[PDB]
Ligand binder design. Structure first.
Ligand SMILES: Nc1nc2c(ncn2[C@@H]2O[C@H](COP(=O)(O)OP(=O)(O)CP(=O)(O)O)[C@@H](O)[C@H]2O)c(=O)[nH]1
Length: 567
């Protein structure tokens, strides 16, 4: 059966000449339910050619590689009155960046002001300038009218020859039925009633709604109960699915993009990242603080994970997974910002969650463990080199360049391990007095320092009871350290309320003070951004739609000491 399978992507755009095609192919198979689709799997014969025409987003999201890592060739579709358009553009790049061999299709030649030839000329000039190098052919180049003249052929039925064009040029999916089973989860969708659903194209072997499998990068042992799969415009189930079909699989682990399934007996694994992988992961936990659901709306773990998976569909740099703890999730993203947008949004929506310090994703590449470094670019005034020298140095900031712009200012490019960039933005502001300007970007995974840079020089000031903030306590607490609150705010035991000027943590009291027997400094505006860059392993950022709070993982001092200690 394998040899007559056909997997392709489509491209269209602002031009209403897309599909049309799909709905026009109707000369197919007129002999659960959701979701579909993804991918209009027709069925041309005159033998049963199974033709997944998997659909590509003209929307350029946070992507399309993760489609075409399933398909083997492509349909570019273009109207004959206007030409290829600037995100028929983007999409197709990623086509040639895999070994894909485009089938051009000209639509709506029925149009009056038809430029059938000129469009093909215009393709090359805006499609050829992308190398391949093959194609060329690209021949392929079929003419069409969705509302089904000159040039090819013409014309029989217009749609009667298209089928032959796809079968002729588009190869069989080069994957092997024998041996065990394995499949890379390429696409991904969610439903609140069946969890996250696989969607990949099978790389070897066969499956059947109850078995066992395993999930790749570390452990992953879980097994599902059901397998949807594409059939016409439907997404039906059946007894089993063998090789090279864009089939889709429910109820496993969380299941993730790039991540690859495979039998437990003599298997594992699959490669391909490709580059959208993430570099950081902070844990998301349900707000276990005293103000549990007192400022939000959503808070029970079920809702958080429902939201996280709603994000796992369209957001592609995001991978999420589960822990030992019920109410905890390792949420991994391309950057620290990539995550903090998800938080800031979940906040705005009504959520309440506690979040761990962004720890980086250390990765094993060629014997040498490697940690992610980042290109860091920053402008400052001349009286802030003296400060930004020491900081980035202290965080293993290899200095690339200086562009002193004549006047006072100077620009500075660096490379830093991500691990050492965590923290820094709040200091660049605190050193430059806001007049510093800085953003940075992921560059590469290279060997580790390793040592330990991302480490706060200070300790934190923690209240030991719930109550309010007595100004007659806090006037004489800001003498010991820098302060996060002021004139009477509702707090609790475990809650962090400032920074000690040295390294030891003081568990002071913010309650009655006292009075005896028988002005306050304006506090720090800790943004979500910088509460995250603030915390330690033994600290969490609790967030409510209205408020940012920062607390120790374990509250009760005695309880925290009982685990540190160490072994
Ligand atoms: N004359 C002519 N018009 C066509 C042809 N194919 C499509 N069209 C025009 O374009 C529209 C096709 O509808 P539609 O299927 O929504 O196009 P589409 O590409 O799917 C729009 P979207 O980009 O949102 O997917 C119709 O309004 C129709 O008049 C064709 O072969 N000839």
């Amino acid at each position: 059966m394998i040899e007559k399978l056909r997997n392709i992507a489509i491209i269209a755009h602002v031009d209403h000449g897309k599909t049309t095609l799909v709905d026009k192919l109707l000369q197919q198979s007129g002999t659960l339910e959701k979701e579909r689709g993804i991918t209009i799997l027709a069925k041309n014969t005159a033998n049963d050619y199974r033709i997944n025409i998997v659909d590509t987003p003209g929307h350029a999201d946070f992507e399309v590689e993760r489609v075409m890592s399933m398909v083997d060739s492509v349909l570019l579709v273009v109207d004959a009155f206007d030409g290829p358009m600037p995100q028929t553009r983007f999409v197709t790049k990623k086509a040639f960046a895999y070994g894909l061999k485009p089938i051009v299709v000209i639509n709506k030649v029925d149009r009056p002001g038809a430029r059938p030839d000129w469009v093909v000329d215009q393709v090359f000039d805006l499609f050829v300038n992308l190398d391949a190098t093959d194609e060329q052919l690209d021949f392929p180049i079929v003419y069409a009218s969705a509302l089904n003249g000159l040039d090819h052929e013409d014309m029989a039925e217009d749609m009667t020859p298209l089928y032959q064009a796809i079968v002729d040029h588009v190869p069989a999916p080069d994957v092997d039925l024998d041996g065990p089973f394995q499949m890379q989860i390429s696409q991904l969708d969610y439903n609140s009633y069946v969890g996250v659903i696989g969607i990949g194209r099978i790389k070897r072997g066969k499956v059947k709604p109850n078995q066992q499998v395993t999930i790749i990068d570390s452990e992953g042992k879980t097994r599902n109960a059901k397998v949807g799969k594409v059939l016409g415009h439907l997404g039906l189930e059946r007894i089993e699915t063998d090789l090279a079909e864009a089939g889709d699989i429910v109820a496993i682990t969380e299941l993730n993009i790039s991540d690859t399934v495979c039998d437990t007996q003599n298997v594992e694994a699959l490669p391909a990242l490709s580059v959208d992988e993430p570099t950081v992961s902070m844990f998301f936990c349900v707000n276990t603080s005293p103000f549990c659901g007192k400022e939000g709306k959503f808070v029970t773990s079920r809702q958080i994970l429902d939201r996280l998976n709603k994000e796992l569909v369209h957001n592609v740099a995001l991978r999420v997974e589960e822990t030992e703890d019920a109410d905890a999730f390792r949420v991994s993203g391309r950057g620290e910002l990539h995550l903090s947008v998800l938080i800031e949004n979940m906040r705005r929506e009504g959520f309440e969650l506690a979040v761990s310090r962004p720890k980086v994703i250390f990765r094993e590449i060629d014997g040498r463990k490697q940690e992610p470094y980042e290109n860091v670019t920053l402008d400052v005034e001349e009286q802030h080199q003296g400060s930004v020298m020491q900081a980035l140095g202290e965080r293993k900031g290899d200095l690339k360049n200086m562009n002193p712009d004549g006047k006072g200012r100077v620009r500075l490019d660096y490379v830093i391990p991500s691990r050492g960039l965590i923290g820094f933005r709040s200091e660049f502001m605190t050193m430059t007095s806001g007049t510093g300007l800085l953003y940075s970007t992921f560059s590469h995974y290279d060997d580790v320092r390793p040592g330990e840079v991302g480490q706060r020089q200070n300790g934190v000031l923690i209240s030991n009871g719930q109550g309010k903030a007595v100004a007659f306590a806090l006037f004489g607490l800001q003498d010991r350290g820098k302060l996060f609150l002021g004139h009477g705010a509702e707090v609790y035991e475990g809650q962090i309320i400032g920074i000690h000027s040295r390294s030891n943590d003081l568990t002071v009291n913010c309650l009655t003070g006292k009075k005896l027997t028988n002005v306050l400094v304006p506090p720090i505006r800790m943004t979500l951004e910088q509460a995250l860059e603030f915390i330690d392993d033994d600290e969490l950022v609790e967030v409510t739609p209205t408020s940012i709070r920062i607390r120790k993982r374990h509250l009760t001092e005695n309880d925290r000491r009982r685990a540190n200690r160490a072994p």
